[PDB]
């Protein structure tokens, strides 16, 4: 996983975090997603155990508990494609996408 971003198709697990500067986004053991120093939380404390954050290929963030039930979602969706949720250094998690340009160093020239 990246330090400060989550991509479409990736999972932030229980105890996982994204960090940028003093801001620390944690998918906590109590199922609450909390952005330390950012005054924000999903407010899902005690709505499950073994919770995981994902990001859909429509740009929606989704928290699911340990038995697959959706406990929270960001609601905003856009076209189908690749997205990234990034911890901005001013202290906000922002969903950007779809992708629009790619530089690929694995192939010629």
């Amino acid at each position: 996983l990246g330090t400060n971003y989550l991509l479409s198709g990736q999972t932030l697990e229980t105890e996982g975090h994204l960090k940028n500067g003093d801001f620390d986004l944690v998918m906590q053991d109590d199922c609450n997603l909390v952005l330390y120093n950012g005054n924000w939380q999903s407010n899902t404390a005690n709505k499950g155990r073994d919770c995981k954050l994902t990001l859909t290929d429509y740009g929606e963030l989704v928290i699911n508990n340990g038995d697959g039930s959706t406990v929270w979602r960001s609601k905003a969706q856009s076209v189908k494609g690749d997205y990234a949720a990034v911890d901005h250094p001013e202290g906000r998690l922002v969903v950007f996408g779809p992708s629009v340009f790619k530089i690929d160093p694995w192939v010629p020239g």
Binding site: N20, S78, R92
Partner: protein, 111 residues
């Protein structure tokens, strides 16, 4: 000004004079010779613009296009990726790909 993060470039930020993004095994460098180069495995990449301008800088705008300009604002290189108006981010990802995502569709806000 937006504070710098090593693997990101947000709309409005600029790189120049060997400023670069850095991630695992890769660097994307806006060199003092006016060439934008992605260093690291396998092949790497370049804009192929060595010597084409003086004091060039890279900037991402608010339609998802990345531009190299010289000191007089002549275009040296463009990503040709112009899109909807908004906030974008260039990520030099841990897998080596540099990808422009946007616009922003959702954000947390203080509660």
């Amino acid at each position: 000004n937006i504070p710098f993060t090593n693997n990101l470039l947000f709309s409005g930020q600029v790189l120049y004079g060997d400023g670069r993004l850095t991630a695992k095994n890769h660097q994307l460098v806006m060199q003092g010779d006016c060439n934008l180069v992605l260093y690291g495995g396998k092949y790497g990449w370049q804009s192929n613009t060595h010597g084409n301008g003086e004091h060039c800088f890279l900037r991402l705008n608010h339609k998802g296009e990345l531009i190299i300009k010289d000191d007089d604002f002549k275009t040296i290189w463009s990503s040709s990726s112009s899109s909807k108006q908004g906030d974008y981010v260039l990520i030099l990802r841990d897998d080596g790909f540099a990808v422009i995502y946007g616009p922003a569709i959702w954000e947390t806000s203080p509660q």
